[PDB]
Amino acid sequence: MKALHFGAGNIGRGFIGKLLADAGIQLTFADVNQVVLDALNARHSYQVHVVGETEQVDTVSGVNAVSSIGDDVVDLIAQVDLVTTAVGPVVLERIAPAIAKGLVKRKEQGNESPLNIIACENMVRGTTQLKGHVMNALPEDAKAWVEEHVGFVDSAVDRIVPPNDPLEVTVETFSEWIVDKTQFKGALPNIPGMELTDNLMAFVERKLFTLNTGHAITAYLGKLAGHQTIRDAILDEKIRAVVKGAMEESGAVLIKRYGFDADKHAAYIQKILGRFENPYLKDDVERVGRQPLRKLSAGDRLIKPLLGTLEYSLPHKNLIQGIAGAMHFRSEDDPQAQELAALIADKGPQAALAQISGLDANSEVVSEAVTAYKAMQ
Question: Pick from 211, 365, 369, 370: which binds Na ion (CB under 5 A)?
Answer: 365
Segments of 191-333 assigned E as strands = 194-197
Work out whether 351 is an interface residue with its own copies (CB under 8 A).
yes
Give the separation between CA 310 and CA 292, rounded to whole angstroms. Answer: 22
Name the residue nearer to its own copies (CB basis): 97 or 114. Answer: 97
| CA 166 from centre of chain | 22
Work out whether 81 is an interface residue with Na ion (CB under 5 A).
yes
- Distance from the first to the final alpha carbon of the chain: 57
Name the residue nearer to its own copies (CB basis): 92 or 160. Answer: 92
Work out whether 261 is an interface residue with Na ion (CB under 5 A).
yes
Work out whether 69 is an interface residue with its own copies (CB under 8 A).
yes
DSSP string, 153-193: --EEEE-------SS-EEEES--EEEEEGGG--SSPP--TT
DSSP string, 57-92: EEEEES-EEEETTSSHHHHHHTT-SEEEE---HHHH
Task: State the number of binding residues for its own copies (CB under 8 A).
Answer: 37
Q: Are strands 176-180 and 155-158 parallel, antiparallel or unpaired?
A: antiparallel
Q: How far is the CB of 103 from its own copies (least distance, A)?
A: 13
Name the residue nearer to Na ion (CB basis): 35 or 69. Answer: 69
Work out whether 288 is an interface residue with its own copies (CB under 8 A).
no
| Backbone phi and psi for residue 67, each to the nearest 5 degrees, phi listed first | -70, 135
Closest CA to 278 of 58, 10, 53: 53
Work out whether 361 is an interface residue with its own copies (CB under 8 A).
yes
Name the residue nearer to its own copies (CB basis): 21 or 98. Answer: 98
Identify what 359 binds: its own copies, Na ion, none; CB under 5 to 8 Å per kind.
Answer: its own copies
Name the residue nearer to its own copies (CB basis): 213 or 218. Answer: 213
Q: How far is the CB of 9 from its own copies (least distance, A)?
A: 15
Cα–Cα distances in Å, from 319 out to 41, 65, 128, 248, 368? 48, 44, 31, 10, 11
Name the residue nearer to its own copies (CB basis): 223 or 295. Answer: 295
Identify what 365 binds: Na ion, its own copies, none; CB under 5 to 8 Å per kind.
Answer: Na ion
Question: Pick from 107, 304, 316, 328: which binds its own copies (CB under 8 A)?
Answer: 304
Inter-axis angle of helices 237-258 and 262-276, to 10 degrees?
A: 140
Identify what 255 binds: its own copies, Na ion, none; CB under 5 to 8 Å per kind.
Answer: none
Closest CA to 24 of 76, 56, 62, 57: 62
Work out whether 140 is an interface residue with its own copies (CB under 8 A).
yes
Closest CA to 206 of 246, 247, 239: 247
Work out whether 186 is an interface residue with its own copies (CB under 8 A).
no
Q: How far is the CB of 242 from Na ion (least distance, A)?
A: 20
Question: Pick from 355, 364, 371, 374: which binds its own copies (CB under 8 A)?
Answer: 355
Q: How far is the CB of 249 from its own copies (least distance, A)?
A: 17
Give the separation between CA 204 and CA 95, rounded to whole angstroms. Answer: 24
Give the separation between CA 142 and CA 127, rounded to whole angstroms. Answer: 19
Candidate ranges 91-99, 196-204, 258-266, 313-321; the one touching Na ion (CB under 5 A): 258-266
Candidate ranges 79-87, 153-161, 167-175, 354-362; the one touching its own copies (CB under 8 A): 354-362
Name the residue nearer to its own copies (CB basis): 98 or 320. Answer: 98
36 contacts 67 by C-beta, under 8 angstroms: no
Work out whether 93 is an interface residue with its own copies (CB under 8 A).
yes
185 contacts 116 by C-beta, under 8 angstroms: yes
Residues within the interface to its own copies (CB under 8 A) = 32, 67, 69-71, 74, 90, 93-98, 101, 133, 136-137, 139-140, 257, 297-299, 303-304, 307, 311, 351, 354-362
